[PDB]
Amino acid sequence: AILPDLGTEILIPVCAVIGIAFALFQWLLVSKVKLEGINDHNVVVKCAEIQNAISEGATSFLFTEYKYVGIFMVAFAILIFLFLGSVEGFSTSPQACSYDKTKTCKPALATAIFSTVSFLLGGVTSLVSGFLGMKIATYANARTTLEARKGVGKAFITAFRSGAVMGFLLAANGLLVLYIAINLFKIYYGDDWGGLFEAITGYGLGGSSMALFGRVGGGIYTKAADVGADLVGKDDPRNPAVIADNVGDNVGDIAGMGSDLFGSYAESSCAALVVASISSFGLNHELTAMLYPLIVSSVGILVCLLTTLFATDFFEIKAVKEIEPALKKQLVISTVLMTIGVAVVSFVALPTSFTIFNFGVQKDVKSWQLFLCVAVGLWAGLIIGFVTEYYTSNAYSPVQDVADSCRTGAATNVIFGLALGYKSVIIPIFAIAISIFVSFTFAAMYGIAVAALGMLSTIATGLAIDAYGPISDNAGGIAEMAGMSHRIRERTDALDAAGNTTAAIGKGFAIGSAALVSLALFGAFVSRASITTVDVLTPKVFIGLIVGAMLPYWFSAMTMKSVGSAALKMVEEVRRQFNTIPGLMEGTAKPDYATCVKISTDASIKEMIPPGALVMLTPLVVGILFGVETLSGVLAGSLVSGVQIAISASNTGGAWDNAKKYIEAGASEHARSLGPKGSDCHKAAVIGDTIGDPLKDTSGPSLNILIKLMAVESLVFAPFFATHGGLLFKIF
Amino acid sequence: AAILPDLGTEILIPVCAVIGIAFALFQWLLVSKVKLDHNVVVKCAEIQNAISEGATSFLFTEYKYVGIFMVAFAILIFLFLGSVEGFSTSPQACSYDKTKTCKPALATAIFSTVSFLLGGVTSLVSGFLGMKIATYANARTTLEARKGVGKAFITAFRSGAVMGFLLAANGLLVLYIAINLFKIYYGDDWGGLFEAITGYGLGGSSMALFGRVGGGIYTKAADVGADLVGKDDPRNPAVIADNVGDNVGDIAGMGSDLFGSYAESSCAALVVASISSFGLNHELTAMLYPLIVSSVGILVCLLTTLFATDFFAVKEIEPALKKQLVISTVLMTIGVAVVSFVALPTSFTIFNFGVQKDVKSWQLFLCVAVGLWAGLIIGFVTEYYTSNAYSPVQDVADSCRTGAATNVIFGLALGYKSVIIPIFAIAISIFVSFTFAAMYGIAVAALGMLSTIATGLAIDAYGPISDNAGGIAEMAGMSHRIRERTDALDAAGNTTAAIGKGFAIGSAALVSLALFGAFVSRASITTVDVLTPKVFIGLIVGAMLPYWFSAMTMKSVGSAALKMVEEVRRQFNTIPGLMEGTAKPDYATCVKISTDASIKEMIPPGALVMLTPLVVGILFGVETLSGVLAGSLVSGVQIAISASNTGGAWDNAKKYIEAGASEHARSLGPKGSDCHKAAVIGDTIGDPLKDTSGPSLNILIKLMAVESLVFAPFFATHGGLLFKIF
Ligand SMILES: [Mg+2]
Ligand SMILES: [Mg+2]
Ligand SMILES: [Mg+2]
Ligand SMILES: [Mg+2]
């Protein structure tokens, strides 16, 4: 191809620098809004004091998280090393390659180390970019609320700039760190590109492993705090739970999504390299083709930068009616730009033809067909988000049909909205099915991997809009609580409901991008374990498959009780707060926020530990006791039945949110029809909302790690399961 | 070569069937000796008359469609199985043995159709007669509460045992009769004999699509027609229309479903074994081993039934039902040991995907046994998760002291965790079955679960009767002593019929798979690769179908309950005398509008189940349909268990508070408390999941297979019409 081995390695890390640079420019412009148009004073001081308490509890949350993360990340690094060393008997003797039997590779010990290096790198990059994101989110929240004094547009812009910092840091870092890791490892591995990219494969697992904390644990917290909206018998800052939630608004949708998307990005990029490593590109050693996934991802930053400027600088917002589109336009602009962008990348850095591995054979693949495989992914993303919009927006028919149920009952609001989520799934599945059936065809599993990266090429703006959402729930709450001009409070609540419609898409975007990555890994694991058939007939698989299909249902049952309990742990903790501290319950003194967070945040991560086991140990148990053939069936069942629950769950929970937020909004005859702000309908809608609060933000999103992480886990430990397979079959 | 000879089998079978029949007649007869101060006895009669006007309005408004469909689909089955051989009359070499000659393929097509019609006609009959004992014996329970608990409960449980035996014998007898009228043609073509007999299974499962989806939507469209504005009061026609509903759903629906589950597992045994030792050689009493296992079931359950009629407080009642189960499980292990001894050779071969595989008859006996003891374990694992008695429902009651949001969250939690142990129970059954026999094992082990279907159905059919007994008391304004007696049965009925809901879904996954394997055995596929996208897109979209099919049964029953509140305004506002006091509401009409509404709401989910084989099987291959049939199984079984158990809890949590019979139940439980209101918002969310969206779900799994088994030659012959074009 046209772009040379230099060209890739001088391009990649420019575009990641440009990314990080962009981000720090945007941060600098949000710093320009110091905490003339001040009107009046003392509400500014009141904002400040709420914004502080946000960080008190935010920076609390993180340190209580890390208290387990270091413990976990070492414990596992050991564990990953032992299990990867033991295939070779920790031999220092160069093994003949597990692909081209003839030529000689490095020892699977020296990958046991190099896997355990990248595992730290990844788990640190997920960590850091989420820290930086938590840090900007807590910065911008009041500096938006404030800029709402000046007007809707001027606020939005200095809120979506903030959200952009998160996307571009997260994406750029994940690209940069990976890019470095490849070049530092390529030093030791030399020409053994197969062996090299089996060790990069840990980076995928590292970010995903972390994602388990950020999205399952932090999820269990965020909605513990939200569902910690409990009397008998006192929404005031004087309730620390209230401000524990506004912290959560940031956690479950910045760290939460960010970790999952970083996960979904990284572990897709590894499954794309491990097929191409044992394909044409990696066999011949054609850097700018191995690293095509990165060339794709690196243009993606460049593209998304440009498309971000349409909503930041060229066009600018006037009316609130224009706001929810401006977000959605971004999505189309990028999708559209990226198709042109990745049309060039395909042209300029792939050879016209090559072979792509699958199950022994080298498949022939013309390089336009790889363009179709990212494109199909690119555009299924755009589709699957919009199908979602429809099912989870008060704009469209079906959310309003739910709102009309809460007239008749609270039992009806919930019934109609269970049914809504259930019916949501159809288009996202068929959409996936098509993106598979295109992709499996053109390239093989490398196509499916490419296609998952396809969904995630746009991942800066994709994140930015997801990141914009919780900034505006804080901006909202910082106005409510600081008690501001009803003019301002309307301008925030505008950004709020727009972000609400937007962050349902966000969950959608992810639950498909998962299934695509959790499939990419799955076959890239089969391609490690050297399986070539998986008979649903042969009972070794089927029993594993039916049990695999059950695991999300079980896993869910944990994440459900987890949040339900820990919210009751929050209630008991506020009861304490009032009944120990003096001047709260009176009103002289405030509560201790930091402690509300900590005491609740542990009780979450504790509650996370069993779900986390079921994710992490299912492969180790199944893979040891029964073969890789049986773990194969498990990983398939977890996939098929799991993605269903994930969609239906977080769509029902978005639907009910916006049904309640619709009644509240009163922006139609019908909304007003149901919607006195505390009406009989509003009760049955808001009963519905809190049931959704978990489904939306804890149970459904957690699900897309159970699929993802089980796969990278197995991919990594495929050697170990191959070398010590059915121990329960060895004895019998 | 089998001890009990081919005469001895054929003479034994329909004795048992008729012996069950004769026991059911005897049991209906004894429930007639209960003849129906004053003005309360006529109150009860006034209700019992009105129950029958509603139920018999429903059934007749359903059969408006059942005939219309059965004939239309009969057209369709013949035309499709015909076109396989070009509607040819000239006999064709046997697919099971290339040497010998089989009958012409439209001989199967005609004969499939005959058996399809029989099976529908038996499902229809067994449900019709089942109603006509529930409707009859509901008040005769309430009245007999005037003679205590154990004298009411007996004359209730009998009424359900009648239907359980009537159903059991009828299905066995009609299959048996069909086999001999069919052998009459096929002769030595035992493969092509039992190829037609499987229509019976498709017949029985289609009438479950009417019974427990249409009748499903109705049963809990009425129950959730419990709605203000404005106002148990019989001047509201929905109040009674539900007492018909409590009957229809768990009599006609559980009848039809477990008749279906039975038929299609027995058919799936027959097909497999027709191309194995037994049916290659032509050894009847070894082929018909399924039917011998069944027929002893009747006899074992007849004995056990008498433990809860002749041979033995309100605290005593729930055990009465849980013994009825354990008894006939312990009996039937001996019962089937006998059947396996006296009707099986030392050793044999079973067809799995080409190879005639070594199987020794004791290994076959372990297959019914491992199936038998799954079906015992699985429903006890239910009980634990759906009973006010045990811990996890008592947790859900403590939820409603906090939120009504919390009641539902911790219920959605409940059912989700519910699944784990039943899934291992089903999986452990699978691994042991496939080992010992192969596909025959699974199919036998599914019959192992349904070997106790006589008494199994009795406890499922006692349930709703004793809801009507609790409500016939309430509406007839009876003695408070009497109300605390009938409502005692009601509550143990709520436990028991929740167990039977897990029993059925247990059975289902097993039989769905017995069929799946048999569909692969007919289609001649040696593999089903999860790698090949032909199957993967199948598999993922199979997992999607139940979520779709739920969304429909859900919003069906949702708006259908709101159509029932619409119709109750019309009766109050058009009839002279109602709203005042003069004239009671027309019950026949309040069922009519609601029933059509339900069966019209049914028709699109009833379509999703029915076309999907056809569209997949035609457009794409039997490869793809193999994919789709494995996804819908593994996924839909989870959603099936999650629903009915999530619902079964919230009901029993409400019914715990209402009961108030322990200090903790008093703790939450003023009979309209802050808690009780949250607990009941639970129940009315659980009503569709209880008796509509979860129990229909198992017919999506079941019927998609039998339909696919029957049309598998047509799908091979004119298969991937899209793969073929490119
Ligand atoms: Mg909020
Ligand atoms: Mg909320
Ligand atoms: Mg009732
Ligand atoms: Mg009910």
Author numbering:
A (entry chain A): 4 to 38, 63 to 261, 269 to 766
B (entry chain B): 3 to 38, 67 to 261, 269 to 349, 353 to 766
Paper text:
Membrane-bound pyrophosphatases (M-PPases) are enzymes that couple the synthesis or hydrolysis of pyrophosphate (PPi) to the vectorial transport of protons and/or sodium ions. So far, the structures of two M-PPases have been solved in three different states: TmPPase in resting and product-bound states (TmPPase:Ca:Mg and TmPPase:Pi2, respectively)11 and VrPPase in a substrate-analogue imidodiphosphate (IDP)-bound state (VrPPase:IDP)12. In this article we present three structures: the Na+-pumping TmPPase with IDP and Na+ bound (TmPPase:IDP) at 3.5 Å resolution, the H+-pumping VrPPase with one phosphate bound (VrPPase:Pi) at 3.5 Å resolution, and the newly refined structure of TmPPase with the phosphate analogue, WO4 bound, at 4 Å resolution (TmPPase:WO4).
In VrPPase:Pi, the extra Fo–Fc electron density in the PPi-binding pocket is a phosphate ion, just 0.6 Å from the leaving group phosphate in VrPPase:IDP. Notable was the volume of the hydrolytic centre, which approximately halves upon binding substrate: from 3,400 Å3 in resting-state TmPPase to 1,600 Å3 in the IDP-bound states of VrPPase and TmPPase, but expanding to 2,800 Å3 in VrPPase:Pi. These water molecules are absent in the VrPPase:Pi, probably due to the low resolution of the structure (3.5 Å).
